[PDB]
Amino acid sequence: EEDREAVRREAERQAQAQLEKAKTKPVAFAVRTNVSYSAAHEDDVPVPGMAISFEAKDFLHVKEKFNNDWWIGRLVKEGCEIGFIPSPVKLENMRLQHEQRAKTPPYDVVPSMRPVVLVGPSLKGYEVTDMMQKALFDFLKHRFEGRISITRVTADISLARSSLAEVQSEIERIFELARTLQLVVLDADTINHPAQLSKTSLAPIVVYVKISSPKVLQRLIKSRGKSQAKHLNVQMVAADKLAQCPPELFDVILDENQLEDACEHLADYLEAYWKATHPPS
């Protein structure tokens, strides 16, 4: 009664307590979800209405552990605020309880800021692609100065040649660069296709630098001289492969033919990602 409604209304006060206090805390880690969640009343959220909702493949920033059943964090999305996240055991328990009444881990740890990776317009290690990507890296360096780190990744991180240890340490380095929520951009030599990082926990923002016309790409390659035109076919084949991918495999597609327009598009996207990852106080 109000015998009981002493404790189970002081619990709600003590929960709202921690929740406001975590608003200022740093992000402990991020996860990419493999499942969706929307709270039902019977889920017994420490503060009613304060559970977050998400779909599979969303990203969550986790601040702290409230108890064994609930974490505190936010959906990485503009406007979304701190709330309760069900822990994996709580998700399992809801399923099990649901089955009883009627009678694949849910989270992957990923960097707190998704690393930006550029693919296209063709293969890296040739002039057209390396130079076009270089101009983009240089733009970002100044456009996001003070909020960004751009780093070369020579080790073959798609292997998660390069030893296992060398790959693991580069992966750990990328996680660390993102820990304080600055933008992270990789110049990753070996990555030419989005499917190359799909099995890692890097969860990149994949930027497709796309030349719409194969004729245009061929002419660009030829403009580099016969030392590059010797390798025309392998570059043309690779660009055609990117062009066959469904657009949803890419987070950003830069098909603008002017550097400044491609830069503005990418900057607008990353500025919005900055907002999604840095909620107002």
Partner: peptide
């Protein structure tokens, strides 16, 4: 003089000039 082919051709000229300029901007960094 198929007009569609004419504007396509002009679009490809613009694309090429744009990308050539893009590459040049990378070269002088």
């Amino acid at each position: 003089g198929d007009f569609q082919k004419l504007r396509e051709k002009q679009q490809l000229e613009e694309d090429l000039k744009g990308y050539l300029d893009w590459i040049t901007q990378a070269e002088d960094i």
